[PDB]
Amino acid sequence: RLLRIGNYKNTKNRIIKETKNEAQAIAGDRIRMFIRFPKFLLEKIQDPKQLLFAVYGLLLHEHKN
RNA sequence: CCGUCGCUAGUACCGAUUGAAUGGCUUAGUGAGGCCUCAGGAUCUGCUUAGAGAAGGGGGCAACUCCAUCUCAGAGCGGAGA
């Protein structure tokens, strides 16, 4: 039940090419982002000028083992 | 003996093109600017010469006449000159 990618380097570079193809809003922009976020994790929403709160984007199937 | 088969990406290429950008020549045309020159004369100014007003002096002495000093405008001859 594992994700079997054949060659890491070439598929990695190709998916980076796909990501650069699919860059919907470029670096240097300001975004009102709506992220899917459950109710119970609102208890850790801190003062954003008081706690650092960074947002990092992911790629295709970096979630699969 | 590593020579075909089709795929996987990496390495040199053509130039037939388009889109700009740079430079070298070359044809023709346009051609800013200062300088010299033909002019032009906003303006100022110098002398004279008149006309008209004021102050003084000398004289028929009654107005009036003569001479010196300014002011306002003309006419010439000049110079400078945007």
UniProtKB/Swiss-Prot annotation:
Gene this protein is translated from: TSR1
Remaining remarks: Present with 1390 molecules/cell in log phase SD medium.
Residues of the full protein shown: 527 to 591 of 788
Subcellular location: Cytoplasm; Nucleus, Nucleolus
Assigned protein family: Belongs to the TRAFAC class translation factor GTPase superfamily. Bms1-like GTPase family. TSR1 subfamily.
Name of the protein in its database record: Ribosome biogenesis protein TSR1
Entry function: Required for 40S ribosomal subunit synthesis. Required for normal export of the pre-40S particles from the nucleus to the cytoplasm. Its subcellular location and association with pre-40S subunitshifts from mixed cytoplasm/nucleus to all nuclear in RPS19 disruptions, suggesting it acts after the ribosomal protein.
Entry superkingdom: Eukaryota
Record's subunit section: Interacts with RIO2.
